[PDB]
Amino acid sequence: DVGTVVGIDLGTTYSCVGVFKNGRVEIIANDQGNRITPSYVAFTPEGERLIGDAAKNQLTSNPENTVFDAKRLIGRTWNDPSVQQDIKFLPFKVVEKKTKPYIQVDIGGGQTKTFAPEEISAMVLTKMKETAEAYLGKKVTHAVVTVPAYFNDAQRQATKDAGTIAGLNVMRIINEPTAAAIAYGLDKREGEKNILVFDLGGGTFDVSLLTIDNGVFEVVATNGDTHLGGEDFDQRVMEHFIKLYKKKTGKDVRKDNRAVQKLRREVEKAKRALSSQHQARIEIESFYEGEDFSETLTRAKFEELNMDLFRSTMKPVQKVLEDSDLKKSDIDEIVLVGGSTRIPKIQQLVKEFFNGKEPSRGINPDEAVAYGAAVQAGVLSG
Amino acid sequence: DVGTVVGIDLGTTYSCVGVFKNGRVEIIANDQGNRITPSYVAFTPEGERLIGDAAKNQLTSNPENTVFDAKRLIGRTWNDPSVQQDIKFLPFKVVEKKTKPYIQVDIGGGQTKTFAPEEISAMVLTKMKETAEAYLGKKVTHAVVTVPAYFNDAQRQATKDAGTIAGLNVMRIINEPTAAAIAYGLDKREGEKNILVFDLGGGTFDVSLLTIDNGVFEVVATNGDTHLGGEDFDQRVMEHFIKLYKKKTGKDVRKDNRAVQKLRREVEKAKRALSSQHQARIEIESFYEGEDFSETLTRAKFEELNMDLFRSTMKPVQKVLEDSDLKKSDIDEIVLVGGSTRIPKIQQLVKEFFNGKEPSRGINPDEAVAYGAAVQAGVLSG
Numbered sequence A, B: 001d002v003g004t005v006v007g008i009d010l011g012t013t014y015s016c017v018g019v020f021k022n023g024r025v026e027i028i029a030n031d032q033g034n035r036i037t038p039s040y041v042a043f044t045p046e047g048e049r050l051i052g053d054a055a056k057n058q059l060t061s062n063p064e065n066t067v068f069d070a071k072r073l074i075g076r077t078w079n080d081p082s083v084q085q086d087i088k089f090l091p092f093k094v095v096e097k098k099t100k101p102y103i104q105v106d107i108g109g110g111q112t113k114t115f116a117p118e119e120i121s122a123m124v125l126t127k128m129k130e131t132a133e134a135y136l137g138k139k140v141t142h143a144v145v146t147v148p149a150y151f152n153d154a155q156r157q158a159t160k161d162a163g164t165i166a167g168l169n170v171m172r173i174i175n176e177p178t179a180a181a182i183a184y185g186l187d188k189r190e191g192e193k194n195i196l197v198f199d200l201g202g203g204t205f206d207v208s209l210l211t212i213d214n215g216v217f218e219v220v221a222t223n224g225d226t227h228l229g230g231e232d233f234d235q236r237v238m239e240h241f242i243k244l245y246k247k248k249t250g251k252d253v254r255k256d257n258r259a260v261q262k263l264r265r266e267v268e269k270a271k272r273a274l275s276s277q278h279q280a281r282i283e284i285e286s287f288y289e290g291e292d293f294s295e296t297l298t299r300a301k302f303e304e305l306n307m308d309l310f311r312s313t314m315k316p317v318q319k320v321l322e323d324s325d326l327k328k329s330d331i332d333e334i335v336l337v338g339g340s341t342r343i344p345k346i347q348q349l350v351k352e353f354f355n356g357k358e359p360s361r362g363i364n365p366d367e368a369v370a371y372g373a374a375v376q377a378g379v380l381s382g
């Protein structure tokens, strides 16, 4: 028996868990009150293993012992050109072991440990499993886990293996855009329809063209940008305030990594506010050399700082349309995925690209993938 | 323990049953393969009690022993002016008993029996209960049953009482326009919205103006025509072919009630076809005095024959707008209910009345009320 099966969106930067309970999907908040959890792991000096918000928000002068972006490495060989490029931008050590890119960190007291990417993803899944168990008041043993549509055999298997390490029997591996289309109830429509899934996550941008025909989904074409996401928008704002602080004080903010991390956390909070307001306030007490930071950011400046990045999302959309032999007017449904799709300028650009066509609406875009996984989990739970 | 709760639309002319199973609403077909069941009861000479399709399609031996339209009498007193008017058009006997209009029929071999309106509706509910039990492969004990928004306390109680007689615990009585809005997920929308429900049934026309605010429904105003529906369109076509047959042969079709019933059944089939095609064929072997009937009906003629009736549906829509102190542009959602709303001219008239505004679409309008009742039943089943 499977018990209550969970639906898990195992994302590059954030993960989300849902269940089907009392006739509906319930997205579960973690111990910090958040319905999304960072796909992050860190180790305290005492040897405590931190997962999620506590890992991402732990102030440190040692970025080399925090692990994230394991989804870029999972199911790939060490010598894969993608891996060789990615390790140049990753602050933690990556070493060749058993043909794979293993992550090497110090787990406390100088104790060096090496982890396969699926062992890191297993830690994230354990945290999602614990989040669901606290909610359900009972143990979880089975799951439906999502993956990007472009994931190959080794990547799907390594994701199932991460589940096994976490004590989860991954019953079904389903494609992220399909799970989002199911969340919007797009499988319950008559005839053949073309669905454009625009997924702008924390670190990756994925565009997928799906067809629905008599309840059956098919991934026709995929495109995007593997290194474009919500964190890039935060970084453009970080650069803006760091240069501005250098002009105003003569001080180089990046000389203190903790000051950088405090600014990063406040910038992310301000970015989210600019999706619903035209001005945000960033305040940090004893920010740098005992001096306080107090600055404002307008929606207009945020947009100006990120305009090239926002406009760059249109190119893969045009490419998928060409590769699927479709025109703009052939798109029956537009599904927005990822918290970044809440940015007004992104919503405007997509709507304008599709000649004023309104996208599907009702589900939080950061939860749509886990929501669809939970719909399937509900069927498997009986 | 409520088990699997069923959602039942107990209609004046037709009824429908749905359940929530394997994560979605399932509308259940009856023993004749139909997703809607006539709200009809008949008694054979041998004393067999027929319910639904077998009752409606029994070649008359019982115009006075076939019961229908019990929903016009339920929860009303015998001396209610509505009852006194309705009994003039009903072919079965209605008698005063216990202050109520009881139905009196011969159940076989000259045995007279008297039934309260809720006892007839209980027979219809028993049929719906048996339809759901055959599908689920287990017994059903609880239900969500819909009623018209204008139903008063006695009418809602008498409907619950019909459920009790049928062995159903009617857990919730919900308004029909509300159930149709729920089917379309209109209760899952943010802010305040005005919903216009245009319900053209088989025998009744109901217009309801609802407001939805933070998931809460309010019936603001109701109007319509208590004696206008799909059956009236069939009658206009009946009159057309009877007059045409008199012109072509000199014969008076109504001298043979069986010939009339055969034409009625074929006209209803042809009308349904004209909603998707521009021409229909009606054929009856040994129709009248051993002569066969073979005629065609165009969509244009069908429309011409019913134009006044179709245009008359606009007047109650304008009245509800005035009684709710709203203008046409204040309507956020248009919900079409009843198989008759499939008629292209009706769809055109409604859309034109609302300056080209497209109504909600995707759910068979004859099943939308049961679908909404099943959505609510699904949450109650847990």
Ligand SMILES: C[C@@]1(O)[C@H](O)[C@@H](CO)O[C@H]1n1ccc2c(N)ncnc21
Binding pocket: A013, A014, A200, A201, A202, A229, A230, A231, A268, A271, A272, A273, A275, A338, A339, A340, A341, A342, A343, A366
């Ligand atoms: C949490 C995030 O910053 C992250 O970059 C990404 C994860 O999918 O989504 C963002 N996100 C989440 C919500 C949100 C918003 N209201 N406006 C901009 N970005 C928003």
Ligand SMILES: C[C@@]1(O)[C@H](O)[C@@H](CO)O[C@H]1n1ccc2c(N)ncnc21
Binding pocket: B013, B014, B200, B201, B202, B229, B230, B231, B268, B271, B272, B273, B275, B338, B339, B340, B341, B342, B343, B366
């Ligand atoms: C069965 C019906 O005749 C009846 O009059 C009413 C019950 O709601 O709906 C009609 N009905 C059912 C389906 C249908 C259709 N495709 N075109 C016209 N009328 C249609």
